Specification:
By secondary structure, the chain is mainly beta. The chain is 3% helix and 47% strand. It is classed as toxin. The entry lists the keywords pore forming toxin, translocation, bacterial toxin, a-PFT, Photorhabdus, ABC, toxin.
């Protein structure tokens, strides 16, 4: 920290592991003073430059309301680690990639966001009503006129979305029960054929837990010869754990695992079947068994979890039948050592996941793996997926920028694709994505293709429509986020969907990234303990108090 001659603000963070002789500077902060140049851009006294584990983020300027007018950043070179030593600014620069990303924004006088410019030059614009509520949204691209993403939005007295109209003419109505003003249903209609794509009714117990969800809309084209959708019913115990549930799944979904099925295609005459699942919990609230049954296909199995007899650490039983051994499958801080047999986990010094080995190879072979860089606040800044087949190595680089995913895919032999994904709004809140290509666009996909997501009660993405309101894809989940149902118009289009259960991104590890932790949907728990400590319960691996139907935790903290 600064010495007492100065306020005492934090200047750096350094760390070492037990086997290391010295520490590395993982974080460093450059603080603004009281000079005119700083005052002129509203930066006096601010931490303008933030050196962290991902790279360096720098403010360029602030509004007189304290919002960011402009900022920019650089990430660390794939082979470098933060060690922001000395006073050599150049040296620090040398640890970074030369690409600089910048974001600019316009705010109203109270700080509402009015516009935002991404690092490529695409610009968002938002409208607000007399109540200061958002009432519409527009997007211009570098080289394109503004499109209307949201044509209109009206809110309830409770400030909840009441009527949402999308640029693709799709209108969603929100039905609330005025006694509590709780959402009781979502109705999505396409005026060109006035087709209600969905009508999701939520039926509740006295607490407010959903005991039934029913889509009264006609089944979609992906359901061959099937027009009537199954009802999702739920049973909860006195502790409100989910004891049982019903729904539907791909007829050929099979065994729940970390694998993700190909989508059903209407052209293949794919169909869906019914299912019921039963959830067995121990007295510590750990899910120990999931009984799966679909008598129609005779898909019958039980997911079995071995729970520690010393701790609440628990693993899929295939990694050990012995509660005593379960503890050895975790490191000293509760981080999972191994995900599945064959896929280990490298946790970093911050408790963040550094790397998943996807395929272990030996000698001179390179492993298939996925690895991550996070900023000093724990948010993921960069995801790298590395495929190393002996005849096919490929790197998938995803840079996380404000409302922008920079998806760069290269083969060890060639650049194959450059896709910018512009996001509008928030995931889990009917976020719309735009797929823009600089290179490698598929011959069958639209450049600047719009993807409008329609989400369920907890933000899971269920439908995705194009600019004409046509269905691109459809997806559902087993209550803990397993994928139960998945369909698409075109497999090419299907390949670009990354946002699923809870509105979270699903990795190649099959895991969902939630802020601070990775969620494992085929086991129903977290891969690391909650950094918040006993914020809610003494079980640091429990997912949503065992009731995902009604509960949601966006941070996993």
């Amino acid at each position: 920290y600064e010495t007492s001659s100065l306020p005492g603000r934090l200047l750096s963070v350094a760390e070492q592991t037990p086997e290391e002789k010295t520490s590395r500077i993982t974080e460093r902060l450059i603080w603004a003073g009281n000079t005119e140049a700083e005052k002129d851009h509203n930066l006096a006294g601010q931490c303008v430059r933030h050196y962290d584990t991902a790279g360096v983020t720098r403010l360029e300027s602030l509004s007189l309301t304290g919002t960011v007018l402009s900022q920019s950043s650089q990430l660390l070179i794939d082979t470098q680690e933060a060690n922001w030593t000395g006073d050599n600014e150049t040296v620090w620069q040398n640890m970074l990639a030369d690409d600089i990303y910048t974001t600019l924004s316009t705010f109203d006088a109270t700080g509402a966001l009015l516009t935002q410019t991404d690092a490529k030059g695409n610009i968002q614009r938002l409208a607000y009503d007399v109540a200061g509520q958002l009432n519409g949204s527009w997007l211009t691209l570098k080289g394109q006129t503004e499109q209307v993403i949201i044509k209109s939005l009206t809110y309830s007295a409770a400030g909840q979305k009441l009527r949402e109209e999308h640029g693709n003419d799709v209108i969603t109505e929100y039905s609330y029960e005025p006694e509590t003003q709780r959402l009781i249903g979502i109705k999505t209609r396409r005026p060109s054929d006035t087709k209600v794509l969905q009508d999701l009714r939520y039926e509740y117990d006295p607490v407010g837990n959903v005991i039934s969800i029913r889509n009264d809309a006609e089944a979609t084209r992906f359901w061959h010869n099937q027009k009537v959708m199954p009802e999702n019913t739920y049973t909860y115990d006195s502790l409100y754990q989910l004891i049982s549930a019903t729904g539907r799944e791909m007829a050929n979904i099979g065994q729940q695992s970390h694998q993700f099925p190909s989508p059903a295609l209407p052209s293949d005459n794919n169909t869906y079947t019914n299912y019921t699942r039963t959830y067995t919990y121990d007295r510590g609230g750990n899910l120990t068994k999931i009984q799966h049954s679909s008598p129609a296909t005779q898909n019958n199995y039980t997911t079995n979890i071995t729970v520690s007899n010393r701790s609440n650490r628990a693993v899929l039983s295939t990694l050990t039948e012995d509660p005593a051994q379960v503890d050895a499958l975790f490191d000293a801080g509760g981080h999972q050592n191994t995900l599945i047999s064959g896929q280990n986990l490298n946790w970093n010094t911050r408790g963040e996941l550094q790397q998943v080995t996807l395929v272990k190879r030996d000698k001179g072979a390179n492993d298939d793996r996925e690895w991550y860089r996070y900023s000093g606040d724990g948010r993921r800044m960069l995801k790298i997926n590395e495929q190393q087949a002996s005849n096919n190595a490929q790197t998938q680089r995803v840079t996380y920028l404000p409302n922008l995913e920079l998806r760069l895919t290269q083969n060890s032999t060639a650049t194959t694709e450059d896709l910018q994904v512009i996001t509008v709004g928030e995931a889990g809140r009917a976020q719309v994505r735009v797929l823009h290509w600089e290179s490698g666009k598929p011959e069958d996909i639209d450049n600047n293709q719009l993807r409008y997501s329609y989400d369920n009660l907890i933000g899971s993405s269920q439908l995705e429509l194009d600019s004409e309101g046509q269905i691109i894809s459809e997806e559902e989940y087993y209550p803990y986020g397993g994928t139960a149902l998945w369909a698409a118009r075109n497999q090419t289009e299907a390949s670009y969907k990354t946002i699923r259960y809870s509105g979270k991104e699903r990795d190649a590890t099959g895991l969902y990234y939630y802020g601070y932790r990775y969620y494992q949907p085929w086991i129903g728990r977290w891969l690391s303990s909650d950094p918040a400590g006993t914020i809610d319960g003494l079980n640091l691996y429990r997912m949503v108090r065992n009731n995902p139907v009604t509960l949601l935790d966006p941070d996993g903290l």
